[PDB]
Amino acid sequence: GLMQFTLPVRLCKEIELFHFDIGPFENMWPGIFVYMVHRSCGTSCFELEKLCRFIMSVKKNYRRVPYHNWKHAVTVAHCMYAILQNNHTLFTDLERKGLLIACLCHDLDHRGFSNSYLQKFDHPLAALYSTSTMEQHHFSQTVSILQLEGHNIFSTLSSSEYEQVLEIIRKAIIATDLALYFGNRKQLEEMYQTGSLNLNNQSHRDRVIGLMMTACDLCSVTKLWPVTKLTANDIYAEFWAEGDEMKKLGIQPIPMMDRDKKDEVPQGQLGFYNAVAIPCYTTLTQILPPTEPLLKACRDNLSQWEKVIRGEE
Numbered sequence: 001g002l003m004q005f006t007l008p009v010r011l012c013k014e015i016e017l018f019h020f021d022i023g024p025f026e027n028m029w030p031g032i033f034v035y036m037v038h039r040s041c042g043t044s045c046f047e048l049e050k051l052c053r054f055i056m057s058v059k060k061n062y063r064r065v066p067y068h069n070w071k072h073a074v075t076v077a078h079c080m081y082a083i084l085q086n087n088h089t090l091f092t093d094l095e096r097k098g099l100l101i102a103c104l105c106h107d108l109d110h111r112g113f114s115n116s117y118l119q120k121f122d123h124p125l126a127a128l129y130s131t132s133t134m135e136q137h138h139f140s141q142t143v144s145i146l147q148l149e150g151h152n153i154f155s156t157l158s159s160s161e162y163e164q165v166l167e168i169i170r171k172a173i174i175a176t177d178l179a180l181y182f183g184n185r186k187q188l189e190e191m192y193q194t195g196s197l198n199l200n201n202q203s204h205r206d207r208v209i210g211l212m213m214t215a216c217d218l219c220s221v222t223k224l225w226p227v228t229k230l231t232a233n234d235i236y237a238e239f240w241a242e243g244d245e246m247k248k249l250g251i252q253p254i255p256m257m258d259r260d261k262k263d264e265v266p267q268g269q270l271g272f273y274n275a276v277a278i279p280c281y282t283t284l285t286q287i288l289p290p291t292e293p294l295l296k297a298c299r300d301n302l303s304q305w306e307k308v309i310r311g312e313e
């Protein structure tokens, strides 16, 4: 009951910042996450014994893939923590509870392949879920782990609070399907620019939580350049594997996923920052002003990719 998780001084300080890297010590990530829940939500949102057993089951159900791994899960959860801490009063007791869990769980049991690859390979998951294939599977894995004995961290909620939190987590996880991001952001642009945007409108909150999830999910583009650059390796290692598997199915993969076209990476980062990242953190900063650091870091790293092309690194 009186057991405050504390971190070494540098982490204690650095963790509050958007650009925090959680480090190479796997065995500290669970304590980083519990620390984040306690400061975000309260020391009493969750029975500690249930929380810990949930975290270790979630961890076990992430695979040893180069990017879509347990490190990713905790990285996206920490970005959500930074957003929630710099916007204290805008979110309910339940949204704070559900969104960190949503982020930790958001890529559960990912195999390192796009929804696109499942559809062309004709994976059973693509017959069970026609759109947002992996994302419906991720949510489905969350519920499975929540129903393991001694793993219901939401046990103390009412019947209707429990249903509310599982619906926050479902929409939060579906929103990480980047196919849905584009429309979601355009609608948020329009609504904020005409003044229609209203945070008491539940369907408007949903869109804003949706955009936060894209932002946290893409947060590797908002790090110090050496972190961004080294994560890009892990990211491309999956794409090139998936490209290999597309070729095995007798299909030329998009150049992004083609490991013969490594030369084109810097320009592909350009495309991505201009088409996806900058628009994402631009619209997010308009809706949620204290998140500007994400936009500024994203801009700084775009500038760093421009420099790679110009042969200045």
Ligand SMILES: Cc1nc2c(N3CCCC3)cc(Cl)nn2c1C
Pocket (backbone or CB within 6 Å): 178, 217, 218, 219, 220, 221, 232, 235, 256, 268, 269, 272
């Ligand atoms: C975080 C991040 N995500 C991507 C990404 N995708 C998002 C998921 C599907 C495509 C594409 C590219 Cl080219 N870079 N990139 C980065 C840096």
Ligand SMILES: [Mg+2]
Pocket (backbone or CB within 6 Å): 106, 107, 134, 176
């Ligand atoms: Mg995903």
Ligand SMILES: [Zn+2]
Pocket (backbone or CB within 6 Å): 072, 076, 106, 107, 176, 217
């Ligand atoms: Zn993700």
